Structures are given as C-alpha cells and as structure tokens.
Amino acid sequence: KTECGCQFTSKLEGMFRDMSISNTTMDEFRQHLQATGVSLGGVDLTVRVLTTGYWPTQSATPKCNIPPAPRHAFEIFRRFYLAKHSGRQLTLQHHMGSADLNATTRKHILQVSTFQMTILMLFNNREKYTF
Amino acid sequence: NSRSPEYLSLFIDDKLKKGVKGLTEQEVETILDKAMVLFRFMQEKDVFERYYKQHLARRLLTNKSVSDDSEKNMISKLKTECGCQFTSKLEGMFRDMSISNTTMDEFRQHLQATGVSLGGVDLTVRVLTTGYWPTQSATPKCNIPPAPRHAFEIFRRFYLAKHSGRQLTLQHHMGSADLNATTRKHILQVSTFQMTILMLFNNREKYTFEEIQQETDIPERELVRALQSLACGKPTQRVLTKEPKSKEIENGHIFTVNDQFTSKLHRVKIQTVAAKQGESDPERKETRQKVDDDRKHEIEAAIVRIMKSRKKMQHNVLVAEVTQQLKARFLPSPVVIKKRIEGLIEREYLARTPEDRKVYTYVA
Amino acid sequence: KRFEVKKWNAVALWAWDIVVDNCAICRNHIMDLCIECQANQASATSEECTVAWGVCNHAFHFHCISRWLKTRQVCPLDNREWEFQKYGH
Amino acid sequence: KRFEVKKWNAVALWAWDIVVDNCAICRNHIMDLCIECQANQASATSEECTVAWGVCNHAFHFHCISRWLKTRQVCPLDNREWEFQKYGH
Ligand SMILES: [Zn+2]
Ligand SMILES: [Zn+2]
Ligand SMILES: [Zn+2]
Ligand SMILES: [Zn+2]
Ligand SMILES: [Zn+2]
Ligand SMILES: [Zn+2]
C-alpha cells in the first residue's frame, strides 16, 4: 500500500478477508460434523472455502474418481454445505490440498497431495493394476 | 369485458414466466413503458392488482434468480403509475420476502448446531405472513414424509423455543423438493404434492387409489390432479406408470415406475404444474367474488375514513364524492354501494339515520 | 431404498395471538358474530361482520377493530399501527 | 484394509449466481458473445468480449457490465460495489 498503492494490495486485503472467511467456514463445518464425529468417513476433515477470481486457475476443476472413506466425508461435507450454507455451488476438483494416509511393524502415516488418493484407493480395492 | 384486465394479468404472468422475452435490456425498458402505457387506459385496477400479487406469489415461491433486478423497476413503475397504495402493499410483501430469507439462513445455522436427526440433510424453510400472501387453501393435513417429518419437527421445536407466540401451521399446497432417485443417480423433483405418494410407494410398492385414499387422509379435491401429474397425460419421461392405460382415473389401478433414460442430466424435473393458462370456471368465479368483497372493503373504508371530516348528505350528495374518489379504481356500482351504505345503521360507525336524513352523527 | 429425499423447501406460515377461540377485543370467538351482533341475523341487511386481518398477523371481528380504531390505533396486542391486510378468515 | 485415510484437506471453491447458462445482463450464456456482439465476427477488430468476474463472485460478459457501470455501479444481484477480480472464464 505504501509502495504501489491500493488496487493490487487492496484486492490482497480482500483476499486475506476471504482467508478469514475460509478459516471460519472450516471451523463452522467441523462444529456441524461434531454430531457423530470421528466416525464412518467424516473422521478428520479440513475443508477450505475460497472465491473464484480471488485464486489463480491452475486448471478447470478436474473430475476424476474420489477415494474410500473420503467419499463419505465429502458427501457429509457437501450435504452440510448445501443444507446450512445454501446459496453457492461447490465445484469439485483435485489439483489442490493434501491428506494423511494412515498406513500399516508399525503404523506409519503417509501423505498424499490430492493426486495419489484415487490410485491408492483403487489399489486398496484391488492390487496388481497397471496404466 | 373484465376478462380483458384478467388477460393483462395473464400477460404479466407468461411474460415474467419466459424471463428472456427481449434479450436486449433496452428493448425491455421500452416494452415495459409500452405495457404501463397500455395499462394507463384501463379500468378495474382491483383485479389487476390481485392477479399481479398472485403472479408475484407464483414467481417468488418457485425457483429463484428470475431477474433479481427488474423487481425494483416494476415497483418504481407501480409507484409512478398506480401511486402509493397497492404498491405499499407490494413493499410490505418484499419486506416479507426479506424476513423469510433471513429466518431460512438463521434456521440453517441452528441446524448446523444440533444435527441429531438426519431428516434435515438439506433444508430450505420459508417464513411468510398470513397477510401479504393470499389465502392458499385450508392448510391440508395429509400424511407427510418422515425425513421431512423430522425436519419439520426440528423446525417447529426451534420456532417454538425462540419465536413463542407465532404458532406454525402445516400445509402442502406450496413449495418443491429434490427427490434423489437411483444406471445412474438421477435426482427428480416433486412440488410438495407427490412426496407422500412416492413415500408410500417406497414403504410398499403395488398400491392403488384405495391405498392412497385410505391410509393417507388427503383432501380428494387436490389429490386427483397430482395423481395425474404423475401419470395421465405424461410425455416419454414417465416416472409413475400403470397397467390400466386409460385417460380417466379408475380405482383399482396398480402403479409402477419406469427408467426413462431420456433425461440427459442428473436434475430432471416434472413441471406439469403451471401449464397453459386455462382459468377454469370454479377458481375464476371464486376470485371474482373475492374481488367483489374487496370492492366492498374499498367503498366501506373510504366512507368511514372520509365522511368523518366532511359534511352530510340528504339523498345522493356524498355518493358522488365516494364515487369520484373511486373513479380511478373501478366502476361505481350504484346498486351495490346503495345497498351497502344502508347496512351500517344497525352497527353505528356512520349509521346514517334513513328517516331522519337531515343531520348525521358527527361522533365516533 | 429406491427414492430418498435430499432437499426440501417448505414454506412455513405463522400466526400471532389471533386466538382462534376468542377475539381479543370483544371476547366471543374468532368467528361466531361479535358483541355488536350477537344473533346471526339481527337485521343483517347486507353489510358484513366477518374477520379483519392486520399486518402484525393479529385477527379480530372487522367491527371490533373498526370500533377500536375510534378509541385508539396501534393494534392492542402490540405497538404497531393496525393495518387491514385481509378481510375474512 | 492396508491403507486408510485419516485426514483430508480439500479446498472447496464456490460460485454466486454467475448463471453458466444465461449471463444475467444479456440473457444469452456465460459465453457465446453478448447482445450487441452475437455474431462471432461482427468486425471483432482485436478488443475483446469475454467474461468479467466480480469480487462478489458474479459473472457477466465484460461488455454488458461495462455498459451497466454507466446505468449504476453496485452489482444489482447484491449491494456491494462491482469489482473486476478477473477477465475471462
Ligand atoms: Zn370481536
Ligand atoms: Zn359485528
Ligand atoms: Zn398486532
Ligand atoms: Zn451479457
Ligand atoms: Zn460484446
Ligand atoms: Zn454480485
């Protein structure tokens, strides 16, 4: 604001207000998922709510198959967001985020950045796959 | 003809139903100016306002996002053409719309709180006032679906835990729904009429008219219609088929379901309601008697409010004034007003002593 | 199941202290004549004597609130100017 | 199972009434040119005629909302002043 002036960083303050919106919506949705929480697929969820123009388009919201318990978690989150936050359209994508894959001699938890979830889920359903 | 103002009403209706007539926004302003100019040379504004309010109720209690900006232009043209009377009623109805949306968001917030029953997975309740909105019906009390049962119970408990004194009333002749059916999962649509029949089918298939008329207790009047909205006269998108293929409705006819993969999407709706404008005798004559009672209201109110600060009449002096005040509203109806002014005698409030028609009581 | 409801959009109407068992001005009933009518007939002579509906969702016999508008104005069960948003039940 | 998902952190984008089937300023489509343009060519002469994105997540053809910035300013669908947080779909 002191070097280039409003315009760009003014939109950037708007984007930090959008970040506040996201972190409030995440906590609000965890509160909504407290009913029967840590169960089925909605065990530990961290959903973020951003605005279109605000964030750069890395792609056109990809539509590949989504994972196992994660299916139930996403269904619960979408039902909540359509029941309470009715007014917007939640488009699905894969080119953003992460996850913690609890593998199992000890139980070492892996990490997948929303890209290897589908392939690893297909492996869990049936191993010995190919391209 | 009074059918010409009813027809201006139906014009408004189909016009705003299209919601695309004249893509150019300039052509929209011009056509609206021409419409209000045509309305300028029209009498019987009471039925016009009644049908305009009915069309408002039909366009606001359905799928939203029709124009979202032209409502201000409409109310401004009404203010500049009719005045500040039925347009103030329209402003009250828009305040009612605000109230409803606010209460809806507040209840979604309070459901993200308890979430005990999964009956309200996705909900959208609207709170309106018995006034602004026209008498819908006799609040039908037919058996309601259970997840909707749990949702309505939660909403009623919330509304009684906070807004005590505002008693809630259940009905069926308004709203819609999205029925998630299930080779893909195509979501259907039911306008609060086929929910009970489809729920009874889910509980047990192979039903007939007797089953839906015995263990449901639904007003027969508005029941056969939704029955045929689900079968008689359906295109090749039938969601409720029967073996006895016939136009008229029988009693012992089994109901079935068909796939009908012609739906190229996941949100297929059955919009059998709001068909071609028929305007049948029953409803039309009912609304006509209602507007005759409304003209009675007009004359009576005008008299009691104005003649309290004016002079008295001998035979036909103040009737000319009460007709001039209502010249821009509707016809004077001399016989009706003459029969109605002589009823106040046995109720005071401007009694008008008939025999001693020389000095009227200037009291309250 | 074969059909499961996902969304719903009921519209819920509400009523103030209309007291369907007792008009708050004369105390007789929401319908069934008033204190200034008593007998169903009593020389009806056209006119009327049904029910009046306010903007504050309160209800009384048309005449009771018309006679109350000569004594005061703000609807008796609140502090809002009484309007006539309806005529009849 | 061998691999079980414990945490997830999707980020869910949202859209207002952009109406992907009828830009709410030309009543045509989110794309497919505007009322005056229509014909893909119509002497394009460089310039443009794509889509404009507001801060209130509403979308219209750049032309329509630029010609509406003379009629008013605050995006009609809401009450916030229209911003230009994007250009193109
Ligand atoms: Zn009374
Ligand atoms: Zn009476
Ligand atoms: Zn009141
Ligand atoms: Zn446009
Ligand atoms: Zn253009
Ligand atoms: Zn906007």
Curated annotation (Swiss-Prot), chain A:
Q: Which residues cross the membrane?
A: none
Q: In which tissues is it expressed?
A: Brain, spermatozoa, and testis (at protein level). Widely expressed.
Q: Where is the signal peptide?
A: none
Top-level taxon: Eukaryota
User: Modified after translation how?
Assistant: Neddylated. Attachment of NEDD8 is required for the E3 ubiquitin-protein ligase activity of the BCR complex. Deneddylated via its interaction with the COP9 signalosome (CSN) complex.
In which compartments does the protein localize? Nucleus; Golgi apparatus; Cell projection, Cilium, Flagellum; Cytoplasm, Cytoskeleton, Spindle
> What is the annotated quaternary arrangement, including any partners?
Forms neddylation-dependent homodimers. Component of multiple BCR (BTB-CUL3-RBX1) E3 ubiquitin-protein ligase complexes formed of CUL3, RBX1 and a variable BTB domain-containing protein acting as both, adapter to cullin and substrate recognition subunit. The BCR complex may be active as a heterodimeric complex, in which NEDD8, covalently attached to one CUL3 molecule, binds to the C-terminus of a second CUL3 molecule. Interacts with RBX1, RNF7, CYCE and TIP120A/CAND1. Part of the BCR(SPOP) containing SPOP, and of BCR containing homodimeric SPOPL or the heterodimer formed by SPOP and SPOPL.
The entry's family comment says: Belongs to the cullin family.
An additional note in the Swiss-Prot or TrEMBL entry is:
High-glucose conditions in renal tubular epithelial cells lead to up-regulation of CUL3 expression, significant increase in CUL3-mediated ubiquitination of MRPL12 and dysregulation of mitochondrial biosynthesis.
Instruction: Provide the disease association from the record.
Output: Pseudohypoaldosteronism 2E: An autosomal dominant disorder characterized by severe hypertension, hyperkalemia, hyperchloremia, hyperchloremic metabolic acidosis, and correction of physiologic abnormalities by thiazide diuretics. Neurodevelopmental disorder with or without autism or seizures: An autosomal dominant disorder manifesting in infancy and characterized by global developmental delay, variably impaired intellectual development, and speech delay. Some patients have seizures, others have autistic features or behavioral abnormalities. Additional variable features include cardiac defects, failure to thrive, or brain imaging anomalies.
Briefly, what is this protein's role?
A: Core component of multiple cullin-RING-based BCR (BTB-CUL3-RBX1) E3 ubiquitin-protein ligase complexes which mediate the ubiquitination and subsequent proteasomal degradation of target proteins. BCR complexes and ARIH1 collaborate in tandem to mediate ubiquitination of target proteins. As a scaffold protein may contribute to catalysis through positioning of the substrate and the ubiquitin-conjugating enzyme.
Q: What is this protein called?
A: Cullin-3
- Origin species: Homo sapiens
Residues shown, of full length:
459 to 613 of 768
Curated annotation (Swiss-Prot), chains C, D:
Principal subcellular localization: cytoplasm
Name a GO CC annotation attached to this entry: Cul4A-RING E3 ubiquitin ligase complex
Pathway listed: Protein modification; protein ubiquitination; Protein modification; protein neddylation
Q: Result of mutating residue 37 to A? A: Strong reduction in ligase activity
In the record, the effect of residue 72 to E is given as:
Impairs UBE2R2 activation by neddylated Cul2-RING(FEM1C) complex
Kindly list the positions annotated as binding Zn(2+) 2: 34, 37, 49, 63
Please tell me where Zn(2+) 1 binds in this chain.
Answer: 23, 26, 61, 64
Effect of changing residue 58 to A: reported as: Strong reduction in ligase activity
Coiled-coil ranges from the UniProt annotation: none
Its Enzyme Commission number? 2.3.2.27, 2.3.2.32
Tissue expression pattern? Widely expressed.
Q: Which domain of life is it from?
A: Eukaryota
Q: How changing residue 56 to A affects the protein?
A: Strong reduction in ligase activity
Describe, by residue range, where the zinc fingers (RING-type) fall in the chain.
Answer: 34-79
Q: Give the residues the record marks as binding Zn(2+) 3.
A: 56, 58, 75, 78
Alphabetized, the UniProt keywords read: Acetylation, Cytoplasm, DNA damage, DNA repair, Host-virus interaction, Metal-binding, Nucleus, Phosphoprotein, Transferase, Ubl conjugation pathway, Zinc, Zinc-finger
Quaternary structure and interacting proteins, as annotated: Component of multiple Cul1-RING E3 ubiquitin-protein ligase complexes commonly known as SCF (SKP1-CUL1-F-box) complexes, consisting of CUL1, SKP1, RBX1 and a variable F-box domain-containing protein. Part of a SCF(SKP2) complex consisting of CUL1, RBX1, SKP1 and SKP2. Part of a SCF(FBXO3) complex consisting of CUL1, FBXO3, RBX1 and SKP1; this complex interacts with PML via FBXO3. Component of the SCF(Cyclin F) complex consisting of CUL1, RBX1, SKP1 and CCNF. Identified in a SCF E3 ubiquitin ligase complex together with HINT1 and CDC34. (Microbial infection) Interacts with human adenovirus 5 protein E1A; this interaction inhibits RBX1-CUL1-dependent elongation reaction of ubiquitin chains by the SCF(FBW7) complex.
Q: What is known of its domains?
A: The RING-type zinc finger domain is essential for ubiquitin ligase activity. It coordinates an additional third zinc ion.
The family assignment reads: Belongs to the RING-box family.
Indicate what this protein is called per its UniProt record: E3 ubiquitin-protein ligase RBX1
Organism equals Homo sapiens
Gene for this chain: RBX1
